[PDB]
Design a protein around this ligand. Sequence first.
Ligand code: DGT
Ligand code: MG
Lengths: 120, 52, 58, 97, 320, 344, 56, 141, 49, 63, 459, 97, 38
Amino acid sequence: MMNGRPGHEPLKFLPDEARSLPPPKLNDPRLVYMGLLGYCTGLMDNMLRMRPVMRAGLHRQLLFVTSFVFAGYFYLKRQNYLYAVKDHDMFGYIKLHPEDFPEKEKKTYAEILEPFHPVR
Amino acid sequence: PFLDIQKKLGISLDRHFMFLSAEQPYKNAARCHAFEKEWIECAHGIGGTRAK
Amino acid sequence: TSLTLLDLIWLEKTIPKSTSTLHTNMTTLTTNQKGLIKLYFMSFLINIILIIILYSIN
Amino acid sequence: QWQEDPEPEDENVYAKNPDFHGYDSDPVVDVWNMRAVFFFGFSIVLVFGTTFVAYVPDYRMQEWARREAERLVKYREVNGLPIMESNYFDPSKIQLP
Amino acid sequence: LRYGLLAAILGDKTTKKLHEYSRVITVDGNICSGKNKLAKEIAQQLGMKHYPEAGIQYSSTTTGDGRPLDIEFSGSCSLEKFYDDPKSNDGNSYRLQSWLYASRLLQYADALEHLLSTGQGVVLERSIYSDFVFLEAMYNQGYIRKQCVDHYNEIKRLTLPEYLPPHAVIYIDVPVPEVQSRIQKKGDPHEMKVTSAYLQDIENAYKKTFLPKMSEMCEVLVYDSWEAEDPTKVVEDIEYLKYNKGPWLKQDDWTFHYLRMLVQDKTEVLNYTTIPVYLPEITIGAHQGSRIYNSFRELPGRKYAPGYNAEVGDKWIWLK
Amino acid sequence: MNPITLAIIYFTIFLGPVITMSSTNLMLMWVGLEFSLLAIIPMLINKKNPRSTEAATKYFVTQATASMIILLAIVLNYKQLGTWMFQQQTNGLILNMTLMALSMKLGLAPFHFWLPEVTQGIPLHMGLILLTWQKIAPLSILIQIYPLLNSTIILMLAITSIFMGAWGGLNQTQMRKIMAYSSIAHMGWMLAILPYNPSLTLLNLMIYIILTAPMFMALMLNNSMTINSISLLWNKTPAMLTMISLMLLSLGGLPPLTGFLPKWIIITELMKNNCLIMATLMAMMALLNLFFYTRLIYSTSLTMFPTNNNSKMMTHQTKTKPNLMFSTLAIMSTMTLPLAPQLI
Amino acid sequence: TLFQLLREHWVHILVPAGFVFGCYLDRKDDEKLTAFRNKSMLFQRELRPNEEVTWK
Amino acid sequence: MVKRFFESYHEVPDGTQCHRKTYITTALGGICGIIGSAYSVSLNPADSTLEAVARVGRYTFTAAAIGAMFGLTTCVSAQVREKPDDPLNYFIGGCAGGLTLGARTHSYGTAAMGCVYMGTAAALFKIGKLEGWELFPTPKV
Amino acid sequence: KFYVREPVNAKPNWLAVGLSVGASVFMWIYLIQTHNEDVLEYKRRNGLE
Amino acid sequence: DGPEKNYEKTLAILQIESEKAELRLKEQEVRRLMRARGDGPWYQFPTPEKEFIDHSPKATPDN
Amino acid sequence: MLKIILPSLMLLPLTWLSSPKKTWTNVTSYSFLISLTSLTLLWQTDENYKNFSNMFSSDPLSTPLIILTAWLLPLMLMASQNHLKKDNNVLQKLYISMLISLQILLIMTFSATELIMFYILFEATLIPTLIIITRWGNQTERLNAGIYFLFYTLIGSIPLLIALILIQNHVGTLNLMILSFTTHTLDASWSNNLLWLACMMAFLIKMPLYGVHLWLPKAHVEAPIAGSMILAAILLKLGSYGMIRISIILDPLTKYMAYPFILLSLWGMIMTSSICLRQTDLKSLIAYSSVSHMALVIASIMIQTPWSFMGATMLMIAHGLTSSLLFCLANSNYERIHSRTMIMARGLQMVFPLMATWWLMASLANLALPPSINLMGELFITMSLFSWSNFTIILMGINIIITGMYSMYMIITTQRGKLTNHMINLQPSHTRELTLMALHMIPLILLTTSPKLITGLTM
Amino acid sequence: MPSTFFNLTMAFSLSLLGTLMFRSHLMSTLLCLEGMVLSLFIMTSVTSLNSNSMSSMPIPITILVFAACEAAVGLALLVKVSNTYGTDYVQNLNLLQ
Amino acid sequence: ARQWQPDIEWAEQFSGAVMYPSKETAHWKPPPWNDVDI
Ligand SMILES: Nc1nc2c(ncn2[C@H]2C[C@H](O)[C@@H](COP(=O)(O)OP(=O)(O)OP(=O)(O)O)O2)c(=O)[nH]1
Ligand SMILES: [Mg+2]
């Protein structure tokens, strides 16, 4: 699909149109969940290595939160680019084929006849 | 490819003997070389389902 | 009728433990191989013949 | 015989301390746990929540529906309309097949 | 840092560490045969490390706090309780013997770690290559059973041949009336209560099973009690031994590095002696094990990993 | 094992999937599959026990005859087309030869019988590199040829692998064999989705790798061989108990953990591709993965089993066998279902 | 002001802090769904000049 | 010619063409019994090739019996009820097939198991061919 | 002096602590300059400020 | 707040999810027609490369 | 909604970051404040349903269920206290964490705009209830009970996933009001009949009626009190909220697919009331009582009368509070005597005067008192089923006869009698247990006083 | 040409039947595997000769080198099997069940 | 009083070579823990 799309730079993480997308914010709930995941990574690693799970390994917890937020922001930018280019290819195909995707002029509820199914 | 590292680095390492109509030692053309050349240049980025 | 015969013994014999007995019998008829590679490769040959027959009917 | 500890006997907590309230066996923590769940559970949640429930206004639109039913029955009996028509939607507005 | 492959490739190879004064000596005998005095004199004269006889409380004074812990923490068995009631309905004999065999397995691991780390030799009184004779003397006296013998043989088959045999096996032999006379002259009121048939059984079991098992594969030097009392002749016969016939002369530096990888962490050392075989003598139940773990973690020094206990005084707990 | 041959064997087992995922010559990723076979074999035999040589020769004879069947498929592609890469106008017999050979090297259910016996004779850190890394590369050539794969043989292979991954784990109580069987059910899922959407094949491969690789690291952490040996975890290392419980139930695939999301997105693309009752049969026979994982979770972390007296030295001694990679792939598996669209 | 009392009574912050954060994130979600505002035919009113927004 | 010989199941409805209906259902049962007996012989071998071919004949006799009496009972249930467009004739034919399978293997519990399971599977196959379900669909979306 | 055997993590590895803290500080600085540069680049690219 | 906040918030939710329904059904029909014909960008299975054909004159005259 | 969801999510550092002496008092006081802030969903001044976000919606049928979740959390955390007075701190905090997480995802399941979010948090209950039952259960058969609970609910819930993804790829968005309003009638097709069975079988297992009722008494006599109260009082009826919310897709097919489930429901409720006449275990007797009271609302949502839906929702919250109080009394008797046989502990009114009054009020709300919501819900279900068919009232009359007989059989067995005098360890009733059944019963008395809140979706 | 290529396909189907069964030894199965090496060389060289695609002459020496190298790996694998057992047979290898 | 925990007779039913035995799986030896056969 995206491997076969034309104009695809091979093995490119962020192309030039991902800069044309709006970048995600740091207050976003996926990055908030990944900061919670980095803190839970430090808590689980300190619990297995038999540490005080809050007091000990604060630098490793800080690297876990920072590296999790960094990888999640970069992957969130790439996945936002992928869903945006899926929307662009679909809207371009809709603009290319209106005779293959016609507008559905739905009739009104006075005009149609829904069958009435009474329960008693 | 899956990891497209040959297209990423721009260097052909296994790609220069991929079909029958690739380049040959001392310029000796294979049988059906013109047929393979016209088949690839008629399937030149058309896609598989439209090209078949 | 209601406590022993229906709920304790026959709804338990029909819905959970019949599928438990069926899956127990299926696992004992599946994982009972002798560990020989000859028997494994004869089953491999039979299923390769099955894939060939499935292609020839398709 | 396998090495297992025997069954621990259920000692009388009322023989241990007389003001045992069902909580953890420290009596100060037990008494303040009772005061905390009584003041935070029985006092400010049941009574304040019953006050908030009883002073929710027009729950499931019943009081407005009674006042609009009184206004509508008064308007229909003033202008001479029947008090409920048989068909809700208008047959002039409808399109029959 | 720690002995990994990255530390091993820089030049921490054991062939530079090993020399002629780097041998594994075991000093062996019956009950009260002068082995601790001879081991202290052997390690003092050859400059080796005197690891003592590992008891029930070896691991508590070896790793962790260093204090010997209580009767139910690193125990659930007593040598005094075995000497009082050997045919026990609680199964005290297998709990003493299996805890002692795992304790001397940890002692053999720490001795091999010390030798392959600093290059200095080590002594090891009543090692794991001779620890089977106490269980088979218990079985020939009838204190334990045949399935107990097969489970200990399975434990020894898991734990023995991944290791290396000792270089020198000093045996101090002494007759059974002299064993009874020295165990009366020691004066312990519970170790006096052992039977002479147990000592005769471990003596002829030693002379018929262990010594053809060990003399055919590594160096065994035998000595009497009056000949091993004065230790200068013993350390000179240790020093002038050829050390030719043995399994220590065929492994290379990366075989020694994989031995140090198998030996240095104790979670693969002690794993094969706590394999699940549910014999009722050594099986701690679930409530007793949970109570002993949730009383073990409330001991000072053993709550967390070592170097991480803020209640004792391990500093720099904020950034580590 | 000197570090020179350790580095070359680890570089060759890294290299074979790399040349497989990089090259587009069909014989060149046969060459990568041959590198995978070659570099796995001395790792299989290097413990030098008599079961390891038996597992190594079982692995060699099965994977080598699958290498010869896919080499027949490459040579018949050379006869039919004159090129090397699989193009659209080729015969279905050659593609069936390729799918049969790659299901032999991958371990699907008409060919699965070597995989529990191969996994039984080997140590656990070879099961780490055989259960996850080895099966990237035959899956990656099978991703590369995804319009050419025939859906009848793909779905019958999927149904049999879901059925026999359900029906091989319940009778059999060893950990390496039971996770070979659960892995067989997981490639039943990622072979079910394969001609419809290979990005979800990559997704189920990535979720199964980050769900099986820290689980094999947790088996490596105590060398827990049997179900009773993983039941001794509460006295060996009790701190991993709820994390290995969440990883066990996630490898079974319950919400709100991550293993529901392969079943959910496979059911999503399958009902988009109009396949109703056969994906219904797959998701109904997926519950026996929770049968052996619920029996295994009752062994390790929901009932405290009887321990023994010599596990108190496992309480005594320190442990450094935990890795950082276990904790980060453990929580990156077990809490990522609220991140699932970014995980697509 | 005692350290033990502060360490054992800092835990009472969190559920009121969760209440404040929940009300803030609900009012942040209130700003997102404003594409229908003073445009439904039940409540299509002329805006009074003291306000620029009909509901907040 | 095997697949178009097997496609006489659907070109003529049940309640007609009963002899070759029973013949193609017995042929489907015989093909499944031949591959199941080949699986059983190649997996668990007997001590003799005579006992292996007796196991092959017993397995294909059991599978030809359940296929023949399943097709014949759904054909005579279509004869009695004179309705082709229902799944209950396939339900009662699958229950009679599972009853004959459990009568062959001599256990009434797995006779009831085979009755309810192959009646559910036969009603599912008839309901799929009635509503046009796809067993092995081509990838279109 | 409490433990009879000296632990491997009794003292913290200060190069590892400083490398971890400086990697997180550089990675946060790189993320905030990447987010500010991407916000300014998107405001340049869309034509609306 | 009033019922108008809940009503117009409900109308925004219904607008967003009804457009989500029309683009999910549109995405299914676009992907179905793209796998059927392959006119647009998606689902284009790869062809061999035009560049590696030797366009130099060869030793054989007609090939 | 997020002011109810997210401070319940912030109850996790309240559990894990406090002193072990103070976990119970901080978590119970702040969970009572969670119930006080979860009383905010009753601000319906109009029939427009409250939709706070695109994630979560408030429904008039779902709001007494949502106050019953947030009210059932401190009633479980009271009852676990002397149950866990001997266990250690990290297992105690893990029990409190699993209870709080079960409350969080039950709040989030009851606030569902979208039915696949409902399925995600509907099958997310299957982990922490299994953690409560198969770790802290006090008997041997808790492994079998957890396997029974897990696999009954998963073999129900797999074709629910199948039918939900099929309905979604048929018509578009699975949002509940979108698929309420834009939907069409279903044709009388056999694939639609299998779609009906596939989307209904999960809730038909989760509410116990015959064929598939048997996981409930195993996972009630092998549960603890918090697992038994959650499985008897809201988590069983999570599937009933699903059985309410599914049927708006597919209302034309229910009027002929309804009959075997109403049949199995009515004869299952007669036979389970008949089961409870001869039962040894008191927790099993309250469990099969919950099976009969769930077979009533299985018949009530298998009919689609609006009168039935009000009697259904009234029976939901009345059965939840009554069965939670009865299971708490069974846990109190189990706490005194360390057994659950009714025969071995009789005459308890002679030593417990006010626990006899709470026993009387719980079983005399199980026997359906007329101003209580039990006979209010059962009488409206009787009205709707007599509108369905005039010959059905003898079956439910036989059921109400035997429910009076098992309720006063349990009173006359375990409360009145000779006072078995071989028990020294009948210690007097705790202030915890007496205020726990007071905070059970006083919401039922106030719910009797104001029944406008409990009228459900349809009037 | 199609008679020669179909008889080479028959030789591969025969050697498939040979390596897919076991008579007494693993070594005759490895001889069948090396028969597959020889048959794939003859098939690849015949395909390259009649198509005259002489640029793909690196491929059959790569066939011979990789397949004979894995054949040599299996030959020393049988050496290690006979070293660790003393026997060689197919029925000897049932110890992994 | 106490909750039930597994005993020897509950732990030994998981201790076989296979869980559910048959007529042909009854001779299956339990494998060694070091994976070495004598
Ligand atoms: N049952 C049993 N007892 C053992 C085992 N290993 C050592 N013991 C006991 C035997 C004695 O009570 C004690 C060892 O005492 P020694 O023989 O070392 O004597 P002592 O400490 O006087 O030192 P010495 O030999 O005079 O240098 O430990 C064993 O494996 N099983
Ligand atoms: Mg001595």
